[PDB]
Amino acid sequence: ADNKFNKEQQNAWYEILHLPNLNEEQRNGFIQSLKDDPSQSANLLAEAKKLNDAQAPKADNKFNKEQQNAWYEILHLPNLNEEQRNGFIQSLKDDPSQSANLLAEAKKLNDAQAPK
């Protein structure tokens, strides 16, 4: 097993560190597994991302389809940090009737912060 993270493995670690929806038993597990065997970075990251996406907070039952679609899109936008994401989500919960404008604001920021 590798003694140090290369650039790829380092990036896998940082994403796993920041995946918002992992429970702490899961996050610890992935981080220690990556440290124990850095070569498994791709599989561990894929596994962690699957669990993260599946554990994104459930929409309120009172939401209509437009509101639910906005909710889940915001929750999965890849180019927001979690302060940004949670900000939009809290605003949506406070007033779901603003879900359209909030989604538009979130997507714009996501696209602006996108990588190459």
Side-chain angles (χ1 to χ4, degrees):
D2 284 30
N3 175 67
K4 296 175 180 180
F5 287 167
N6 56 24
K7 310 95 239 172
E8 176 180 354
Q9 294 155 357
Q10 176 66 18
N11 190 28
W13 167 76
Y14 210 79
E15 179 162 12
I16 291 169
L17 174 59
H18 285 88
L19 283 171
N21 307 318
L22 295 180
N23 64 65
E24 299 314 309
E25 183 179 356
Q26 284 177 152
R27 192 188 313 287
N28 177 73
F30 284 120
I31 291 176
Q32 301 323 316
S33 291
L34 183 64
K35 293 164 65 174
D36 164 80
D37 195 351
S39 68
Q40 296 193 40
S41 66
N43 288 335
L44 290 170
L45 180 59
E47 185 179 3
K49 286 177 66 59
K50 272 197 263 185
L51 292 170
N52 178 80
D53 294 353
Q55 288 161 202
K58 191 185 176 185
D60 193 279
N61 285 339
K62 294 188 295 189
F63 286 2
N64 61 14
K65 67 186 180 301
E66 287 83 9
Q67 287 156 0
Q68 203 191 260
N69 286 130
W71 174 268
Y72 285 119
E73 180 158 9
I74 291 166
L75 283 171
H76 295 106
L77 285 169
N79 312 322
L80 299 183
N81 69 46
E82 301 308 324
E83 185 281 324
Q84 294 167 331
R85 192 192 314 286
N86 294 344
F88 293 130
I89 291 297
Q90 185 57 50
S91 295
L92 204 160
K93 295 186 77 179
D94 295 336
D95 187 9
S97 65
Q98 307 292 351
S99 59
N101 289 339
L102 290 170
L103 176 64
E105 183 177 5
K107 288 174 63 59
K108 190 178 75 65
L109 182 59
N110 178 85
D111 298 355
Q113 298 183 147
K116 197 74 182 187

